[PDB]
Amino acid sequence: QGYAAEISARRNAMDNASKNAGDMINRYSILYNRTRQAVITNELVDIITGASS
Amino acid sequence: LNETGRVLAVGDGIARVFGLNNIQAEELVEFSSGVKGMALNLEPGQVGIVLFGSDRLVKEGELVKRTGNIVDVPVGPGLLGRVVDALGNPIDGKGPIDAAGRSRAQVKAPGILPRRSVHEPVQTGLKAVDALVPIGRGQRELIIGDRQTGKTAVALDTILNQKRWNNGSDESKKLYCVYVAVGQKRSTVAQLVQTLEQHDAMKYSIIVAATASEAAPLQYLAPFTAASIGEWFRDNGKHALIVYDDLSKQAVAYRQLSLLLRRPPGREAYPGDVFYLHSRLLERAAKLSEKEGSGSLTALPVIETQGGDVSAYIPTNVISITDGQIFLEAELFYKGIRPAINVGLSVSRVGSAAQVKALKQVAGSLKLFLAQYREVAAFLDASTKQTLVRGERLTQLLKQNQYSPLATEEQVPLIYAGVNGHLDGIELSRIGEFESSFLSYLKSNHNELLTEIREKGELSKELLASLKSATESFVAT
Amino acid sequence: GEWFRDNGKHALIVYDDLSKQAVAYRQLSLLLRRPPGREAYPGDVFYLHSRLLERAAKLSEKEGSGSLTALPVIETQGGDVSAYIPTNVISITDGQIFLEAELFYKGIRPAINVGLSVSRVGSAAQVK
Amino acid sequence: NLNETGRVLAVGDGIARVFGLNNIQAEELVEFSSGVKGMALNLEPGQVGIVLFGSDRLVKEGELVKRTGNIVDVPVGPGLLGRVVDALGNPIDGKGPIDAAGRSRAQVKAPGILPRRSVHEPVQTGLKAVDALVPIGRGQRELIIGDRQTGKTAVALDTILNQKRWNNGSDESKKLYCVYVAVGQKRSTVAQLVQTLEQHDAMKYSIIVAATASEAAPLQYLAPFTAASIGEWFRDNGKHALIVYDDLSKQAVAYRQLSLLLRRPPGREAYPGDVFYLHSRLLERAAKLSEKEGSGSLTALPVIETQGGDVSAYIPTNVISITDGQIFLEAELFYKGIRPAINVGLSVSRVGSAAQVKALKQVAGSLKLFLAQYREVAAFAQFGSDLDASTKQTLVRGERLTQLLKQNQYSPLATEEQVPLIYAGVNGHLDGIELSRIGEFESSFLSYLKSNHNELLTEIREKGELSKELLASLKSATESFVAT
Amino acid sequence: TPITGKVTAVIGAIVDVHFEQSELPAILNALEIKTPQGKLVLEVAQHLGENTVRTIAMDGTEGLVRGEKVLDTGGPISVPVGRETLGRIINVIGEPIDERGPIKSKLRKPIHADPPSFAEQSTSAEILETGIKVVDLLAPYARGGKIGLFGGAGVGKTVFIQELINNIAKAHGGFSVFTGVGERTREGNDLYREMKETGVINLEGESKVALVFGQMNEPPGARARVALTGLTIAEYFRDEEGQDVLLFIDNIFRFTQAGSEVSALLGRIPSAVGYQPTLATDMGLLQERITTTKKGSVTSVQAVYVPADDLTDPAPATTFAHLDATTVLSRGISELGIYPAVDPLDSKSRLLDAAVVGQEHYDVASKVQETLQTYKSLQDIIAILGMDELSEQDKLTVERARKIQRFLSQPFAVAEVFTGIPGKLVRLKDTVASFKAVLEGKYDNIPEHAFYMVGGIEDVVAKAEKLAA
Amino acid sequence: AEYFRDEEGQDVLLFIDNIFRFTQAGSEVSALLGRIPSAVGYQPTLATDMGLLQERITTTKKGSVTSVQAVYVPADDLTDPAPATTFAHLDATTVLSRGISELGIYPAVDPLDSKSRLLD
Amino acid sequence: AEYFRDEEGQDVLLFIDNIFRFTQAGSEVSALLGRIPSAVGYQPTLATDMGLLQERITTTKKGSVTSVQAVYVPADDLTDPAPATTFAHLDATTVLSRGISELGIYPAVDPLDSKSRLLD
Ligand SMILES: Nc1ncnc2c1ncn2[C@@H]1O[C@H](COP(=O)(O)OP(=O)(O)OP(=O)(O)O)[C@@H](O)[C@H]1O
Ligand SMILES: Nc1ncnc2c1ncn2[C@@H]1O[C@H](COP(=O)(O)OP(=O)(O)OP(=O)(O)O)[C@@H](O)[C@H]1O
Ligand SMILES: Nc1ncnc2c1ncn2[C@@H]1O[C@H](COP(=O)(O)OP(=O)(O)OP(=O)(O)O)[C@@H](O)[C@H]1O
Ligand SMILES: [Mg+2]
Ligand SMILES: [Mg+2]
Ligand SMILES: [Mg+2]
Secondary structure (H helix, E strand, C coil), X not given: CHHHHHHHHHHHHHHHHHHHXXXXXXXXXXXXXXXXXXXXXXXXXXXXXXXXX | CCCEEEEEEEECCEEXXXXXXXXXCCEEEEECCCCEEEEEEEECCEEEEEECCCHHHCCCCCEEEEEEEECEEEECHHHCCCEEECCCCECCCCCCCCCCEEEECCCCCCCCCCECCCCCECCCCCHHHHHHCCCECCCEXXXXXXXXXXXXXXXXXXXXXXXXXXXXCCCCCCCEEEEEEECCCHHHHHHHHHHHHHCCCHHHEEEEEECCCCCHHHHHHHHHHHXXXXXXXXXXXXXXXXXXXXXXXXXXXXXXHHHHCCCCCCHHHCCCCHHHHHHHHHCCCCEECHHHCCCEEEEEEEEECCCCCCCCHHHHHHHCCCCEEEEXXXXXXXXXXXXXXXXXXXXXXXXXXXXXXXXXXXXXXXXXXXXXXXHHHCXXXXXXXXXXXXXXXXXXXXXXXXXXXXXXXXXXXXXXXXXXXHHHHCCHHHHHXXXXXXXXXXXXXXXXXXXXXXXXCCCCHHHHHHHHHHHHHHHCC | CHHHHHCCCEEEECCECHHHHHHHXXXXXXXXXXXXXXXXXXXXXXXXXXXXXXXXXXXXXXXXXXXXXXXXXXXXXXXXXXXXXXXXXXXXXXXXXXXXXXXXXXXXXXXXXXXXXXXXXXXXXXXX | CCCCEXXXXXXXXXXXXXXXXXXXXXXXXXXXXXCCEEEEEEEECCEEEEEEXXXXXXXXXXXXXXXXXXXXXEEECHHHCCEXXXXXXXXXXXXXXXXXXXXXXXXXCCCCCCCECCXXXXXXXXXXXXXXXXXXXXXXXXXXXXXXCCCHHHHHHHXXXXXXXXXXXXXXXXXXXXXXXXXXXXXXXXHHHHHHHHHCCCCCCEEEXXXXXXXXXXXXXXXXXXXXXXXXXXXXXXXXXXXXXXCHHHHHHHHHHHHHHCCCCCCHHHCCCCHHHHHHHHHCCCEEECHHHCCCEEEEEEEECCHHHCCCCHHHHHHHHHCCEEEEECHHHHHCCCCCCECCCCCECCCHHHHCCHHHHHHCCCHHHHHHHHHHHHHHHHCCCCCCHHHHHHHHHHHHHHHHHCCCCCCCXXXXXXXXXXXXXXXXXXXXXXXXXXXXXXXXXXXHHHHXXXXXXXXXXXXXXXXXXXXXXXXHHXXXXXXX | CCCEEEEEEEECCEEEEECCCCCCCCCCEEEEECCCCCCEEEEEEEEEECCEEEEXXXXXXXXXXXXXXXXXXXXXXXXXXXXXXXXXXXXXXXXXXXXXXXXXXXXXXXXXXXXXCHHHECCCCCECCCCCHHHHHHCCXXXXXXXXXXXXXCCCHHHHHHHHHHHHHHHCCCEEEEEEECCCHHHHHHHHHHHHHCCCCCCCCCCCEEEEEECCXXXXXXXXXXXXXXXXXXXXXXXXXXXXXXXXXXXXXXXXXXXXXXXXXXXXXXXXXXXCCCHHHHHHHHHXXXXXXXXXXXXXXXXXXXXXXXXXXXXXXXXXXXXXXXXXXXXXXXXXXXXXXXXXXXXXXXXXXXXXXXXXXXXHHHXXXXXXXXXXXXXXXXXXXXXXHCCHHHHHHHHHHHHHHHHCCCCCHHHHHHHCCCCCCCCHHXXXXXXXXXXXXXXXXXXXXXXXXXXXXXXXXXXXXXXXX | CHHHHHHXXXXXXXXXXXXXXXXXXXXXHHHHCCCCCCHHHCCCCHHHHHHHHXXXXXXXXXXXXXXXXXXXXXXXXXXCHHHHHHHCCCCEECCECHXXXXXXXXXXXXXXXXXXXXXX | CHHHHHHHCCCEEEEECCCHHHHHHHHHHHHHCCCCCCHHHCCCCHHHXXXXXXXXXXXXXXXXXXXXXXXXXXXXXXXXXXXXXXXXXXXXXXXXXXXXXXXXXXXXXXXXXXXXXCCC
């Protein structure tokens, strides 16, 4: 009985782990896109500053 | 060329004029084709005009005539029930505007001494807003959220609600309304006007429109001219509301205009001036003292975030100006919580003095209760179960349908029942049904309660006990 | 290649590699003081690779019968297909043979990443 | 005439374009008629770009400018010891004039390939972590890098305070004179620094060069080069010296301002192209001279601030590339009670064990391996999985060792006191004590050795190396004491 | 005869003037234009050559016409100073704006001045007991020191300053100056009302706070120079009257921001993310004047705004170099419902050393920070796997850390509008005792919510006996 | 389609493929004219450049031009300025899915990702 | 090295440390020479300057030069335009790694990233 309960609990724990990892994947995907846009813009501002000489 | 000039070059909405020796800065100029422009840069030997129209309309060598007036807009009662573009031309197709006067587009905001702390309510008719994040007359309250989250719905319901007072003679209780469409589709503004005409609200509201095709300077200018339109109500002892829908598109238009002037870009490619734009726009919202006639102008600026990023540059800059924010979260709008008011981020720094005492009484400490419900929901223990049942049924209680603004006299019993615990007797799925029955009951049995709440605005222990006993007399069946 | 194409013969042209050619065009554009763009490329870099690559064709039986196949080669940085020049070339081309280094280490050579590789047009031409 | 004098064309933001001065040299000094001084940095076919060492409010268009005939230079000598000077060497402590042995140009050619010698002897800092894991040798350059409020200044200031054990002695080949360069700091910080150096009675052998935040950008720029010139006199006369730059990042910011207001073309992050050249020509002046050149040495400690921990940024990248060794202070470790916050993984000393004191080299040999193993085993254990007892032993000993390196501020330990502690850590007999009370142990153990085992300390100091007899003696002493 | 010239160009807030004579105005001099609505003041920023001088307008530039006359006042913008300045509200130009009439001061002084020399700086340690738990524990403030409240938009900076004024300004015997730089006007009106209610101002008697306001509606040049005006008032109290002085500034970031606004129009190449090249040295020139000297003691609290909540932005980043104690406010902590949202780890102070506060206090604070950093480190594991996966020691540490986090919250009286909790003021010794007790595990049992919004350990006990009902 | 609407009254469909390339071509034209680029390197006057195209697509007293526009979103990022400025104008979205086509569903319109302003 | 190759006829080893400095130096002058900065601030001529240097080094029919040249990798990023442009010219790549050195493993060569033409 203990073994059956332990394996069931492992399934529960890993399911919750996958759920929360998915949520964090969403958050960091949004943060990644935001940071990518910021990097492109800031890297372009230097070029614009130089060209305005 | 003292009072007139000729164009040297035109491009990307910016025109360079030779002459115009006696022109004032920010003065309005008329081109030979009838299109108009603002004298922005006064360099030596030339003037930099920015064009309130498509630049196709101006060509090199044409003469430019001085208008002699700073950029201004009409003001007065006659604008009421009209639709106008920036600079105040009537675009609704009806006759010319009748104006009590004209006012500069960028009059300076009133200073320190003229103002009073905001001590009167703007009754939105929305349970969540009126209860948890109230708006006082003269307040500036941001409405912030992602695409398609009911922002315009919130502002529009607030505009629609005022009909129960605007029909009276009591100018001290009325609330006139201006709505400023910037960057919106022309069809959307037309449909919104139709909605206002169907609910009979148009007769007390003004619509200022700078639609998506309008040249960038007009989108930049629209909120300022609309603020000037509301300031006449403010300054003549009447009460106005102004909705900006939305300031993000004004910021984008200003970014366009600034970059085509080749002023250097800043953070997120916005110019460093972008704070000053919204600051000098919004500080004009105020309530003046008894010496000035007690007028006010309540602002409801809208902002559209990406992915709920309240930390973005423009959202933060606007929050740095407004007195509070109402944050609408998509993650709640989907899954059917409407108007999806996220109470975790929403705050009203001058709110608790605005509420009518009855609603403040029954709504006691709800803003803390629903933040504790968040802690419970994040993670059964019978105490947490009690609070969880209350939280679920209370959030259900806050839901509301579009174009159905509850009067406060009817809101009070609902929040009373929800807070003091009777709704434990009703399964949550029927709460809406409950309301529709309960209010009807109160409207046909002992209307005395609604009359007392309407006139007095505060609950004595007699009123409090009467409402307890009547809500018990309902919940038993 | 276009000579063969136009005179009824079949040809295949391999551009190895177009990113370095884009860098060369960037050198020319910047030293001519033309306005920069993203990653300092001129705006015309899409027009540059488009004007090159649209020249591959299978002509109708009226206009001769020849063809010109093209196999442009692109070097990604850290697998960033999101980069500017990779984005343009991926848009312009009809498909993608994709190679991943992680597979190359596993002894899977010539390391075609079957998942990300696609051929929109070729499946109609494959031998029966 | 316009050869020896000039006429101001336009002035503002601290920059003055001047007409004339046909004969002026690049980088030369000039005096405005209103008494403010300036430095010529742009020569152009009809204009001179002079940058003002002061508020431009006292300069007016059409004002006259006089060529000085001197390229920027500063006084040098032994008289600067115990004093505070601004960038141009004027006293600002108010304690009276400064005696000078001579003057030296602000920027000077670094010693070449021929005159130098191998980095040959220690800079004992008195910090257990630095002296044990990442030693600094005399003539080395050691970048101290980390985010705001991470103990950088504390580390450098401890390195300065530790020298009192020798600077009071007779043998000048053992002394170490300390120059401190404060760039972009608020004056009250410098005031507290001098108050600390006087409380510890340290600044008999110190020189403080200050270019505080309010002082115009040219002075904040020029300060490090002038302080380098001040130290080079010690270097060239056969006297060991050490310069702390706190910090070079603000010097780079000052140069960015200065060059931008001259309207030179910007580079990456709006820094001018020369921003690598600026730090490289500064830092190459540190050197250990050969016996032919008097055997003196100048050591450098450049401090750098990384925003948000971004060690990848431009200026951090350049200074990491230039300096021989790097010392990384991590904000996270500071809160865990690991203070000083030296990230021992990233930190490296490229001179290496050649610079270490041989006794400490003997005992400290495996400490680095223990901590390297710990960094892996503790990371594995953090996941919550269990493991064999060998990993447990590595974890336990590494935990004790990491607790052993923690140190109180303004309390530098001599190597005669570091050796017993690191010996106990590596060899064992200090792995059984409870982790919380290691601090009680470390304080008491020395207090015991200083009385019950004084001979061992005397030999560890004077003979500098541990024979088998001394290792056995310390084995016995550690086993004896820990049993208590 | 007066030195006069004519306007040649107007762009935004920048006005260029040209003088027929050679007696050019000096830089930083003030010039007057008699616009009908009341004379406009220009400040000379640069000399352009050809006898042209570029200036910053202290008021709206609308209505200016090329060729309008300009007259040089002969000195910098000069503001009133003296004991008569107390109980009054003054504009950046120095004009009254409380409508009570002219300020009858015997002296009038320029807003631009040299910082005090190194021989005059004075250093001393003395904790200013604020009555706020997290500050008094983890980043103590210092009398005569410089204090900074870093934070993003809408995270509590202004309420924090108001609480500091509510606690300290009435107990402190010396005068106070409040310098609203780019704050919202309603905030200044509310401050004036509150100070008249709490008796710090009295129009029929004495007063001991002076008010300088240039609000966020003002054009950028005024928002630049108003801070220096406030500093001038504070300096006159410090040096000549010999008094101890308080100097509150909300918000000093605005001074930097205003510079950027004008920088592009001044004809400068922009620096990183569009800031002006002079940011570091301009901020230094403003900021070094705020110091304490051998003549008197100035204690200053400066709210610092953080654009886009980015603490690495050049303005906050360069501001950190100038402060003795800094208390970063985090939106993340506020969103958890924790107020005053002070980050207990990112805050730092020069005064937190065993030599100053004694070994007990330093040890307790160190242990608190150790616990909170341990909790911060486990966030990934706790979020992904849940708390059941933690080792027993770490799980106990996490529970204790959560209780500590909620214990550090405090209801300010100024915040009664929002908390519904009457404000509490907590003594320093009580704070140290309360946290020492918790770190010893003496209150493991009572729940997490008992520590929320309560002052001192015994109030936690009382709230536990309330939750147990 | 504008002529068809304004002179014959038919309800007309103006299909566009692909609108992202309209935005991209606008960006290139902006860059060649020497304009300073906006965020992530797109043109300034992005919003009004889109508006002059999109506003003309509307109903009148006579008829309407409906438009079905194929949208490419770079990096699958719904927040990029071009997709954002495009979504600002859309009244409905139709989402086709490879997976749904693999399930044998045809025309493979995802019924839950697809959404309309007028489902009201 | 060229004179040894083409006149003396000897085989030659030409060691260079550190060739990144050749690129970096070219950047510093590039700004002052009035050139617009390229991506992440490198000179426009990066590729052709690299070529004009590197392609002189080769084993003509007249003699053999074997060149071992060090490359500094800023912030350990192998994708930085300087190392990324340098890779194209190399027969063998000895990529040393931060990680392997951190493990206490020297000479810290990455066994997977390091590659050579002759592994055949
Ligand atoms: N209380 C409500 N009950 C039901 N539907 C609602 C409610 N509020 C809004 N909606 C619906 O939500 C959708 C979006 O509403 P609305 O137009 O107000 O959003 P928005 O945030 O202003 O949009 P946009 O970003 O396009 O301007 C519409 O279908 C509206 O009918
Ligand atoms: N070993 C230590 N033990 C305890 N406290 C320390 C230690 N080292 C530094 N501190 C304290 O940490 C704080 C920061 O120290 P320090 O002044 O050296 O930092 P810094 O990085 O140079 O700062 P800044 O960026 O402000 O110049 C001060 O309170 C200092 O007392
Ligand atoms: N002790 C507290 N208890 C509860 N809420 C608090 C407390 N302190 C601050 N707040 C909340 O902080 C919110 C914002 O406070 P405050 O106006 O001081 O912000 P700010 O960061 O200075 O913003 P701004 O940049 O807009 O001026 C207020 O709505 C108030 O609800
Ligand atoms: Mg809307
Ligand atoms: Mg320091
Ligand atoms: Mg505030």
